[PDB]
Design an enzyme around this catalytic site. Structure first.
Site, mmCIF file in Angstrom:
data_model
loop_
_atom_site.group_PDB
_atom_site.id
_atom_site.type_symbol
_atom_site.label_atom_id
_atom_site.label_comp_id
_atom_site.label_asym_id
_atom_site.label_seq_id
_atom_site.Cartn_x
_atom_site.Cartn_y
_atom_site.Cartn_z
ATOM 1 N N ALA B 33 42.593 34.338 37.784
ATOM 2 C CA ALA B 33 43.099 35.515 38.475
ATOM 3 C C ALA B 33 42.089 36.648 38.348
ATOM 4 O O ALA B 33 41.721 37.039 37.236
ATOM 5 C CB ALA B 33 44.450 35.931 37.899
ATOM 6 N N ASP B 34 41.642 37.173 39.485
ATOM 7 C CA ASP B 34 40.661 38.249 39.497
ATOM 8 C C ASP B 34 41.373 39.588 39.299
ATOM 9 O O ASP B 34 42.554 39.648 38.947
ATOM 10 C CB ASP B 34 39.846 38.209 40.789
ATOM 11 C CG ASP B 34 40.694 38.429 42.027
ATOM 12 O OD1 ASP B 34 41.909 38.686 41.891
ATOM 13 O OD2 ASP B 34 40.141 38.345 43.143
ATOM 14 N N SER B 35 40.647 40.686 39.520
ATOM 15 C CA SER B 35 41.224 42.012 39.325
ATOM 16 C C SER B 35 42.484 42.193 40.163
ATOM 17 O O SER B 35 43.536 42.595 39.648
ATOM 18 C CB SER B 35 40.188 43.081 39.675
ATOM 19 O OG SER B 35 39.764 42.952 41.023
ATOM 20 N N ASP B 37 44.422 39.936 41.532
ATOM 21 C CA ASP B 37 45.490 39.030 41.129
ATOM 22 C C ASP B 37 46.167 39.513 39.852
ATOM 23 O O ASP B 37 47.392 39.416 39.718
ATOM 24 C CB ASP B 37 44.938 37.619 40.949
ATOM 25 C CG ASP B 37 44.623 36.947 42.270
ATOM 26 O OD1 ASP B 37 45.551 36.775 43.089
ATOM 27 O OD2 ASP B 37 43.446 36.590 42.491
#
Lengths: 50, 72, 43, 50
Positions: B33-35, B37
């Site tokens: 999960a990125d920023s 997400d």
């Protein structure tokens, strides 16, 4: 005046609440689509990042 | 128990199943999960419990376990 | 804005308190000055 | 930010074409000179196969 701004805060809070439901419900579907798309379409064919 | 909320929501927000998440791992890099997400995950947690989490406290949930630590 | 409004409420209450004290002082001063006007008329 | 934003789409289109091209080949390119040397190897294979 500041009490009326407090009531503005309440109105803004319910607006935020609406937006928040929108976001979570949208992600629920993003999940499914990105599950199915992993049949090599997303790699470069559908994800036209231009 | 009540943690079933978190351990459910997390998966529903990250595409992993309930048991996939490990307490030792970190959302930012070990879950994919990125920023955006992670922002979505924390904000969904906020929605589920009908509460608020400021930015400073919200930023302290990078690890899996933290999601329950602030809750319970 | 939420935290700003809370802080502003606190400060506003403080100013209201000190003005309440000055209002009481003004009533006391009015009593004293009523006596003073009576004294002028008596002299 | 405005400069970077104006520049971005062109760079992205170029990168997609480059990735497709090099993936279509066996070797991975990294620089202009590298592309040129790959040109030369391609010519040699032409003139052997012929």
């Amino acid at each position: 005046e500041m009490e009326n701004v407090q009531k503005k805060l309440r109105k803004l809070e319910r607006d935020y609440y609406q937006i928040r439901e929108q976001v979570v419900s949208a992600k629920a579907g993003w999940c499914a689509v990105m599950r199915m798309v992993k049949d090599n379409g997303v790699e470069r064919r559908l994800h036209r990042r231009e | 128990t009540i943690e079933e909320r978190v351990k459910k929501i997390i998966g529903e927000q990250l595409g992993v199943k309930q048991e996939e998440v490990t307490n030792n791992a970190s959302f930012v890099e070990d879950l994919g999960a990125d920023s955006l997400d992670t922002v979505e995950l924390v904000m969904a947690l906020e929605e589920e419990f009908d509460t608020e989490i400021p930015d400073e406290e919200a930023e302290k949930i990078t690890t899996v376990q933290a999601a329950i630590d602030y809750i319970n | 804005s939420h935290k700003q409004l809370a802080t502003e409420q606190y400060r506003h209450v403080e100013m209201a308190r000190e003005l309440a004290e000055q209002s009481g002082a003004s009533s006391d001063l009015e009593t004293d000055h009523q006596a003073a006007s009576d004294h002028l008329n008596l002299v | 930010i405005q400069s970077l934003t104006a520049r971005a789409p062109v760079w992205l289109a170029a990168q997609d074409t480059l990735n497709q091209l090099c993936e279509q080949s066996g070797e991975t390119l990294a620089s202009s000179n590298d592309v040129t040397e790959y040109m030369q190897q391609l010519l040699e294979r032409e003139r052997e196969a012929t």
